[PDB]
Amino acid sequence: TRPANHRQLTFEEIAKSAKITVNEVELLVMKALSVGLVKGSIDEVDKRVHMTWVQPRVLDLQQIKGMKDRLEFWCTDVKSMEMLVEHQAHDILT
Amino acid sequence: PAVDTAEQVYISSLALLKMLKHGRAGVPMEVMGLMLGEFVDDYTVRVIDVFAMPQSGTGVSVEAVDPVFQAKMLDMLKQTGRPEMVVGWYHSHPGFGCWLSGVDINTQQSFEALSERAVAVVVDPIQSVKGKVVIDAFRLINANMMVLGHEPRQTTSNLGHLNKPSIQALIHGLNRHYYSITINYRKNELEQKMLLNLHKKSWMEGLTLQDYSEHCKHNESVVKEMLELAKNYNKAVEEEDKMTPEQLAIKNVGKQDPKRHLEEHVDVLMTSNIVQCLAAMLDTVVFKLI
Amino acid sequence: HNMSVKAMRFPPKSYNKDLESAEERREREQQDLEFAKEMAE
Amino acid sequence: PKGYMDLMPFINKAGCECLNESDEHGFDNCLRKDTTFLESDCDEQLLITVAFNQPVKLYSMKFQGPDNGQGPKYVKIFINLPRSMDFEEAERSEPTQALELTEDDIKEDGIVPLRYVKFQNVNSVTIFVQSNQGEEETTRISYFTFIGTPV
Amino acid sequence: LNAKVRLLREELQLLQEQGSYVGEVVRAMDKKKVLVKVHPEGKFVVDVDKN
Amino acid sequence: LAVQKVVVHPLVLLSVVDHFNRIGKVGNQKRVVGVLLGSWQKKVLDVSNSFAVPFDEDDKDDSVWFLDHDYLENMYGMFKKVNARERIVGWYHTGPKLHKNDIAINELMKRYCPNSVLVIIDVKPKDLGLPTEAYISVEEVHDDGTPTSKTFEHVTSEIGAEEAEEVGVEHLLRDIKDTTVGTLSQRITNQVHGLKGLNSKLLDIRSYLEKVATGKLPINHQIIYQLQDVFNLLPDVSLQEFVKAFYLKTNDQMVVVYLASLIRSVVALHNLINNKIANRDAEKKE
Amino acid sequence: SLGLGLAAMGTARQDVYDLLKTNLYQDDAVTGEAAGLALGLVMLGSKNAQAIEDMVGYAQETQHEKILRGLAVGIALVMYGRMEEADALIESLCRDKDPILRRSGMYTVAMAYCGSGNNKAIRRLLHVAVSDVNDDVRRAAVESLGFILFRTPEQCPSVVSLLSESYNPHVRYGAAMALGICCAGTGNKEAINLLEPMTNDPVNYVRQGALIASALIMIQQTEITCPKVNQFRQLYSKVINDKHDDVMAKFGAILAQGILDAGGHNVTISLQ
Amino acid sequence: EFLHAQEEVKRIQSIPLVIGQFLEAVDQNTAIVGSTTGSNYYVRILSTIDRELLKPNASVALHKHSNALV
Amino acid sequence: VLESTMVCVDNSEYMRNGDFLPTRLQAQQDAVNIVCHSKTRSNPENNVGLITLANDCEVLTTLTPDTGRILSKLHTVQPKGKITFCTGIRVAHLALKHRQGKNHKMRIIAFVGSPVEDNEKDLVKLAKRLKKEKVNVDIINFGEEEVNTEKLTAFVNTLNGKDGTGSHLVTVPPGPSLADALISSPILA
Ligand SMILES: [Zn+2]
């Protein structure tokens, strides 16, 4: 659910969403990390879990449409620098 | 009806590569094959395609043409859109120039009896380098006509005397028992663009960043190399001041030139770091999370 | 580097004169003619 | 058209044989305009031969077909063929021109060029429709004629 | 640059010209004759180039 | 898999182009199919020769198709006699994309070479990509419970040339190949081509997702699984740690560039010194 | 065909054109070369599209090179002295993949710009001379410079002087021919000074072109008019009587004697 | 064309090549080499040869015909 | 005559039946051995090839001036699958278009021993396509002629048109051997 920029789950959020004790949050992440459901790390001092990867899941058409919209911005950025390098290095381009 | 000196033999891009590949693989056997094509006119001989005859056994020389291999290869090539007659034969001369030996002259006479305009193409895969292939097309000079005082061919143009005969070929019977036909190459846009894909790096390699650990170590090592070269470069400047112009170059033989190596290290390092920096900067926005 | 390279002057020497001389280039042709006219025979 | 003209009067209309013709629509429709069309029955392929007097020069043809996809796409043109021509001798032979029609050429307001150098003295013309603009098992031709001059 | 290219193509023909023997002069003679000793091939009486 | 890389030589490309041209001359052909010959080195294929075989397919039905396998055996004995080290390593076809009956043709090809590699050689001169796309037949065991099927798995392709084959290619490309461009300019052109190639790949995915959104094709659930990994792998270049590391690494290369440029300028000054000395000495004696 | 075209130069008669076009369409190498060349001669300067369309269209369809060589000269002659009216054809020919058709564009540039000194036409010729895939087009590109600068003969020995020392012998040959064509009859000492070392060129045909060009430059010229006439007059005799000289260098020397004493010392070459 | 000329001069290095010994550099383009045939020759040096490798007693490949240092 | 023929042998499940002694698979093998041998002596240049008519058609041997290789392939043919006559003729017609010598005449030999499960319209249009390429398909309606006698009737009538006996529809009733009726059939005449 959370974006890749804000994938630092605190121990309270995992405890509240999973109806588990805060002390049991840590063991829960081990099972997810060991099995392979999620990739990431645990920061026990700060009580935060740094997830970096999740198992891909089945997505609805609307979610796919949002995914395609993300490619629209990605394609624009790649095209923008393709013209930028072409324009700037036109004389030395082979 | 004397043949014209302005006659040209046109070898396709596919034909040239086949003889080069077959000739090199058969080094030093004089591996032979048949050239398929069409006698367009009295002045043009097109070689659309060639195929290689098998070597019957050991021996660095041209063997007899195998008729069963030739006939049933020609029959089976006609099925896949190649109804082209045999316009001559090709064979390899691995490194000793392009000419015809005594055995080659006899082999050509077999083709001359069937087709009077048969062409003997000799390819040197060993002496051929990038951008210049050592090739030549030969046709025999009849002894009866030349002995009585007749030129083998008429010269109505300048085209056939643009290439100066090699001394190796002139030694081995050129312009005495056989003559050379100028070879032109037929290249189209389609095949030429297709060959441009050779060594064309993948798009992944262009954006791929070199390992930063090895890049820094290479940065480290080469800069350390200039530390010694610069120290030697200073000595080279003072030495050449008090040193005679006859030894401007003789004294440079057998001793490394710090200036030359410094330029190479600078040139190597400038492209290594600029490409790595630009690739890193391009990947920063192209691959962005936002 | 660009300023220094642009400041390099080549004197207007008689170019293509350090190539093969016309008389000496003829020397090989006469000698090589006898090479083909004798070794081959 | 610029000093040349349409040449159906030269076409004898008696030595014209359109193989793979359909009983529903015959070869007469595409040579007279006035709507209607020619179509094939057995297969998408459609072989057409046209005969006329020996002195005739071809500059262009206007093989306008329909728009649904039944209009010809790849056509083979042969000239002065002794003996009859079956569908194989129109498919396994080298045509004088093998122009691959685009949708713009099929448009009734469209004229396709031919290599005029190779069409100078024509005894008869063999036309081999090999494919249409699609996968329609029958190939249709709304109109067709040769624009040129007698030799 | 043209001279560099022209010299490069002419070098290929030049490099195919046969190399020169290395000999030792015993004594000079009349009519520009010199007695030399080619390294493996004994003694010779040779001409002298006009230069 | 059994193949790590397929190397297609320029002779094969010219043979395939010629094969498509000569048969395409007599009759309009959707594609032409031949047999690829080559050797095996470790796990990289070395496709080096090819010959044409009779082939025809009805466009309406993918099931109807004929390949002259007796011709295939007869022509192999020809090439084996001339070159015994070139064995059947797969087949080729000039169709711009894959065909539904390709998995069927591969089975006929598989009996001569068990690990047959299909290389699609596009005769049309594509501007960005390589003309060759190598595929191998594998058993895709699905996790949805659907029965295992035979699918083509892509194998990376590269055009490489033998020493003598390269010699002929440079002869044919002598005029048009411009080697005057320096190494630094060549790498930047590679980066521009990398940007163009990545952009084209991204548009292909966007085009696929656009059709999926409108219902033109259904959800594959393997591409969507792959796509989530692609966007998850997109690094965050706005992190303080990465920015500081990027700045630290960029400055490390800049000083080396600065040192090399510093050495270049004085070496250039040395050359100018020699030029002026040579010019002054030449005019003094004249 | 050669006689008919030579007798119908510029007459643009349809009957001659129709007969010659029939011979060209016969696809004969020997006949087509003369028919193609005569086709341009008969329709010399007519610039009509039909002659251009027939000849250029035929040149892209015939498979015989001898026909192309005749057509290349013929196409150029149709648009002779047409100034910028040949611009459309020139870009079409110079952009062609056929080497001979590209050679026709260089010839078309020469005839559309005979003595006009058009630096735009000179700009195109010099570009092709130094940058072209085919040596024949390069040789013809330099050759066409003579037809554009013959009205200002002093201008040729400056533009073409550096091309006279190029690596490519074909450009060097054209450099000789450009001086011969442009400085024909003028006895230009600057042009003759360029040809004098070229008569000792390592490549045989470059020597032939220089010898022929020298004859064109100083035809009828005397010792007082041109100091180097006697030196070259003995040079022609030396080449002919040199048994060890290449035959085509002698071909130029024998021709050079013919041009030098042409018309019984009573004719000159002058494009103006 | 300079690159083409550099590329095309490498055919002088085509095998077979007789092996010599570098003895003395007379000038830039000429040197004295001792061929393994037992004869000392005064031959030319290919311009694309790294003269920093022409150390004394260095084995050099010579043209089988002209004995030139290639 | 100088013609190239392809035998569309059938190996469907119905070939295990003993309606023809000893087995329909064995009976048709003798049928091929005689019809293929007949085409050899009619012209030594005649071409004969094998195409199987299983669930998916499989060209066992292309056209060849050899007889023995045809039977060795037929030895390994086992009963399996259902007849697919629609695709069998086209895959056999495709090989006919790629024969050794284009001067040979089209000819296809079909061994229909299982019912053709197609509409009459598709069978009719197949005949019109073969008539376009002057292809003559010779069919023996053995096996299930009680239900194929009408579908194949439209096949040959449309191919033969109104004139010329290009193709034959000889139908052998079950008995001792269908090959014994082949030598009297116009196929071998
Ligand atoms: Zn030989």
Numbering used by the authors:
A (entry chain a): 283 to 376
B (entry chain c): 23 to 312
C (entry chain V): 487 to 527
D (entry chain u): 120 to 270
E (entry chain C): 52 to 102
F (entry chain Z): 4 to 289
G (entry chain U): 478 to 749
H (entry chain D): 71 to 140
Sentences from the paper on this structure:
The 26S proteasome unfolds and degrades hundreds of proteins to maintain proteostasis, regulate cellular processes and generate peptides with second messenger functions. It consists of a 20S core particle (CP) capped by one or two 19S regulatory particles (RPs) that gate access to the CP proteolytic chamber.
In both datasets, 30 s and 2 min after substrate addition, we observed non-substrate-engaged proteasomes in the RS conformation, with Rpt3 at the top of the staircase, Rpt2 at the bottom and Rpt6 as the seam subunit bound to ADP, while all other subunits were ATP bound. Local refinement of the PITH domain and 3D variability analyses for both RS.1 and RS.2 allowed us to separate two major PITH domain states that we term forward (49.8 % of particles) and backward (40.5% of particles) according to the PITH domain rotation, along with a smaller number of particles showing the PITH domain in intermediate positions. Thus, in the absence of C-terminal tail binding to Rpn11, the PITH domain appears to form a ‘blurry’ interaction with the RS proteasome, using just a few contact points on Rpn2 and Rpn10’s VWA domain to swivel between forward and backward positions by ~91°. The backward conformation appears compatible with deubiquitination. Indeed, for a proteasome conformation similar to the EA2 or EB states, which were previously proposed to reflect substrate deubiquitination, we observed TXNL1 at low resolution in the backward orientation and, in addition, detected a low-resolution density bound to Rpn11 that may represent copurified ubiquitin or a UBL domain of the FAT10 substrate. The backward conformation of TXNL1 is, hence, exclusively found in RS proteasomes, whereas the forward conformation is populated in both RS and actively degrading proteasomes, with the latter showing additional interactions of TXNL1’s C-terminal tail with Rpn11’s catalytic groove and active-site Zn2+.
